[PDB]
Amino acid sequence: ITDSLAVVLQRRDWENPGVTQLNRLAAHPPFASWRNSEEARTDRPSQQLRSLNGEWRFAWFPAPEAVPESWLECDLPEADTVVVPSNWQMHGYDAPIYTNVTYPITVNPPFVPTENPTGCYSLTFNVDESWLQEGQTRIIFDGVNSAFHLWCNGRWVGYGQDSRLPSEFDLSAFLRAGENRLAVMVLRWSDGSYLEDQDMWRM
Amino acid sequence: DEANIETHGMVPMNRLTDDPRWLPAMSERVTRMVQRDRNHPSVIIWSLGNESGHGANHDALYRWIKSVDPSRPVQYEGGGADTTATDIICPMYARVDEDQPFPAVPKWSIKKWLSLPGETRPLILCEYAHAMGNSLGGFAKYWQAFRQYPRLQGGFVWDWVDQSLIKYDENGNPWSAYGGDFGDTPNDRQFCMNGLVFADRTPH
Amino acid sequence: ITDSLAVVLQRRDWENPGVTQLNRLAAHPPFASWRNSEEARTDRPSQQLRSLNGEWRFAWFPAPEAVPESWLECDLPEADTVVVPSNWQMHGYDAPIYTNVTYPITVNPPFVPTENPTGCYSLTFNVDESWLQEGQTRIIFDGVNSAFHLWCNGRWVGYGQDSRLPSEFDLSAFLRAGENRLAVMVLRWSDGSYLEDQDMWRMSGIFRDVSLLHKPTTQISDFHVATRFNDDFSRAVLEAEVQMCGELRDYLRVTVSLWQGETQVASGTAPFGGEIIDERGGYADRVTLRLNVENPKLWSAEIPNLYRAVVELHTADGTLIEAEACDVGFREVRIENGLLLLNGKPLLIRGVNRHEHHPLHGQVMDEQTMVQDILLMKQNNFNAVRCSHYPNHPLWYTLCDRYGLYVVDEANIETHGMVPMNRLTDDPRWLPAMSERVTRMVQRDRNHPSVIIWSLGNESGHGANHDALYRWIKSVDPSRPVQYEGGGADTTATDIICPMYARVDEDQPFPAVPKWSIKKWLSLPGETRPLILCEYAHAMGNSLGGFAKYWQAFRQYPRLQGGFVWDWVDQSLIKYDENGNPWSAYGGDFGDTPNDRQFCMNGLVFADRTPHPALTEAKHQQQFFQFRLSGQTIEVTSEYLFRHSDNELLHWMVALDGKPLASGEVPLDVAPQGKQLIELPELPQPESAGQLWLTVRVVQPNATAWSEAGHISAWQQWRLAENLSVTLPAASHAIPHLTTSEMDFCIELGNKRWQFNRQSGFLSQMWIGDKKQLLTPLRDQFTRAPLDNDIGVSEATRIDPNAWVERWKAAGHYQAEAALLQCTADTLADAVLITTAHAWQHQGKTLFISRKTYRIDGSGQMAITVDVEVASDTPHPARIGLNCQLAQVAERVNWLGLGPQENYPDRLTAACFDRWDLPLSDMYTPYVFPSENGLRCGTRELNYGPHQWRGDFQFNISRYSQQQLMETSHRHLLHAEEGTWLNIDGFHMGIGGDDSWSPSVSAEFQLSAGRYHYQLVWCQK
Ligand SMILES: *[C@H]1O[C@H](CO)[C@H](O)[C@H](O)[C@H]1F
Ligand SMILES: *[C@H]1O[C@H](CO)[C@H](O)[C@H](O)[C@H]1F
Ligand SMILES: [Mg+2]
Ligand SMILES: [Mg+2]
Ligand SMILES: [Mg+2]
């Protein structure tokens, strides 16, 4: 219930420079968690590290509000299957903008426009329970533009800003053995946007 | 390595950078970077960001890094390319011999810049020789100067690849698109194409 | 619904350093929103400003969760009516805690404990709708500890952290005409708590003012003032920067006027829009004016010259939108070439640290008190104060501005309990939080002239966050230097070397963060900064020993620019006994755990603002006039930088052993930093025997704003001469008669009789007539009821085997047994002679040996001679003297020696040698935590009752045995003993105070000679 959109979006974290993250872990150099020296030594691949890149389900909305509560629970009918990672403008969802100096949105920090292209990404996956027993399990987004909320198995997890750095969260307490489902709600505009006026395509 | 901060559209440019309220946000942007990348030998300079004027938040951040990672110098062009927040004079587009004396943030000929009273820093252009379209005229002037003045230690050309996107015609023919080609508004058109190479990595 | 607690508290903002506020407005100097220039100009009261202080409804809960949803809606049945502002522990809701270092809660940032005392405050009020129509209405909390949520008319509004700064919110959209209701939920613990580990009582609530402010939609959002001068201060520039909020229109104007009372000194008007600042342009919504001022009058703590500045936001036609104002001081603070200057001159800080504390109100402040403090300080020669360790109540600054005191503004950050101390300060994650704490302060206080230094906080180690912040300020406000002691007192984050408790000449070389002798500190290779101690001379209990050493050094070393004593007032609270009797309480007195006991009492004054004796020592060492005596000439030197001795009278006087022979008066005429010679009239050359002493005092004929007429501001005395007595006692027509029992010896002479017990070897009783005179036999004494300093602990937990007391105890000083080695009696031609020798031992060790002679003559005088030997290997004893309990009890006490206040060997410079007479009561110092006190040194003659003692000693006298004192923890528990207790010391150890958690008594003050000798004469009238 407090995991409810209605509730979560109430705060409008994306319109507050004071909130740039929620429950996001601390930063650090790259980890693999090898369990064998040699492997690490030779840069092999670590099994404690797993990619979630691939097909995912996507759905676009003109606004966060328009997102339907069910989304949390169940995938949409009208959802598409998409490759991650990617930029949604690249898939026809909306337009990429090429402005230099001038902000794409109206200048009224820390406010973002009411119509803010929301992208609901979801993904269902499996987890070895071995992981579920001992240790700690976190998820990592190397890059999400510009802002976003996150749920795991219906449960609200956290929030993050800054499109260029990684975001990490402890999933440890939301995971179930076997089948899990992530629901990431991503926003075009955020207060972070005011700090991202680079002369490039806005995606 | 450069922090993710550009407030270029603000007015004046440092509207936010000079505001405490934004300090935390900014802060995160620097700290985190550092935290993440500091072990790579290729990173040799830290940069606070780009075109965000010059504000106190900058000074504070500059300092922070200095304290945390003294192994690398810090640079930042905003607000004149020679502020208290930069270890290197890193202007963008300063001419070899001509001065461009804008108010508040003039761009001196780089040879002159070095000699200003009290100036002691090295100078490296953060941006030079705009490679847009049929360009790069005058490149050699720079090289020569760089070669003759010790304190002129080079620069970074702007920039590598054109920021063009592919589109298709009815015949499913691909073509290079730029600003406004997506009905995107507002837009700056070709301005996103300043590379030395074409998006496909084919050389100009 | 989303206004629902259930929902709101879901987030648990108070357990997230990332969230320090929600919907809180921006910081700024104080606004009133006057709508009339004159009013603003004269500081009248603005109607757009309304106080919500008063009766409010309160209810307490063990936890936030326990709060009931209805609360939002309706007041509770079980609610109480309470006064705001206040601290709820002060009303019995829960306990106040007195812990120093150790955090009250468990260390697990950013987590607070589950049981967290919640206080629900509510208030219903009315609003003129006029306000409701146009403009903007916000509310302001000057102080709420530690964190809180807020609702208005059922609607959730915002959240805030940092107990020491104001929180503002726009109410504009929640107000209804007429009846409104606020609901504030306040929490004890928050993540903010981790940044608030100050050594003080841990309290909570809405302890500072609550108010409402009505402002135009288009208003003045902020402004700053700055003064620049020529090389000689012959001319200045006032520069004001103003910012506006609202919508911008070309007919807008700004006017800034400067007033000197009735006089308008300067004015300037302009339209918004700044100079180009960068490639994008300037600030359209700001404007900066520059006013020229010729021969401005400077502000100083010596002479707080003020000006009034008015900022009017108006239209081009003349219509005023609103006004704001402030007092302005023309002064320049700068560090140049190792020195801290003010208006070009190098300062000498006579400072003190001060907390916002009231014995009754807890942490709630008021004008009345504030002023009191100020007055006192000023009267005691203080010129500066440090806001240990958070921004103070706003009024304070004004007062200081007006009265004249230099101030150090300090950010609200102490993480003392962390480990290592900089665990958080060195963490980026905490940077934002920290940041807010500094930025906001600055934003708020920067226009006050009294603030001359910014401080980043206290005892939080040294971390990068510090450096960053230091820098920030430097950039934003270059007008003042920044200091910070953490991490060694000399880091990159401080402009001044500001250690705490560094000794004058001794080094304390702790690892990583050694404390060098301050003279040495300056000379370290590459060091160039000035040094000012942020804390020195711990005033806990009977302390301040060694104060003068500091003063002297300060005076001799240029770069030593003073310090701040720690600290002003004891942090004691009042309690009541069953008889509804009030009494001073300290740590643990509320069952508070954990606690640091007396540790919260380190003031120069008692919570009621009653002075400790130490205060005087301070007053004297800090005097602004210095004297030198040469021949018949007195040299006077002024330590004023800016004023002339225009309210000064010098009274002098000569006395012989107390007998005044001549006195005079001379008006002072000295320039700041100048000398004045005073020629003395031929002095009297008494024949009589005794000591000739000269004494001078400085008086303020006329009253001042902080002093009464005839105030004494300085004094000094000198011994001119000595005429030794060569006379002899005339013959007695008789001589005492000795009688020997088996049990003792009896000396008789007239009505007089003396008895010495033969087994004890002591003078056991004596009679005058048929009246016994003693309840206790006269005997040697080598110890004292430990002083705070002797005990020396800073944490209840940690005991120092090196503490004096520890050593004394362990040595058996407190329990050694006397042993008669010998006792003899003999009859001389003119007297009777008694001889004794005792040994004090402990476990086979002989600690001391005492050898005496008593000689009674025909005149009925008893002369005593004492010679003591002390084992080289025993710890130096606290004292060497005698004691006894007299049967009698009298009203007054009269002596010829140093006085009149309590004075100790290492704390007696302020004392004067003269003849004093006081009531017995005054001979006792009611230190809350009791110990040895009331001593007076350099006494030659003492009178009590029919008795008289002569020699050269120190003594104390009261109704309490040392044992009682030593055994009672609170002043309120002592009770007078049967007669009068008298302690006569041939010698007494110093008291120390460089710090109170280590041995701080200088060697020159220890009883280390090994051999001591003293004599006395006892008689009656
Ligand atoms: C330097 O100039 C180029 C112009 O093409 C870009 O705008 C960069 O972002 C700027 F830093
Ligand atoms: C300096 O020392 C005193 C000791 O009584 C207090 O703990 C202050 O807070 C500290 F800064
Ligand atoms: Mg935000
Ligand atoms: Mg740009
Ligand atoms: Mg918080």
Ligand SMILES: [Mg+2]
């Ligand atoms: Mg402390």
Ligand code: NA
């Ligand atoms: Na070169």
Ligand code: NA
């Ligand atoms: Na470009």
Ligand code: NA
């Ligand atoms: Na000095």
Ligand code: NA
């Ligand atoms: Na203390």
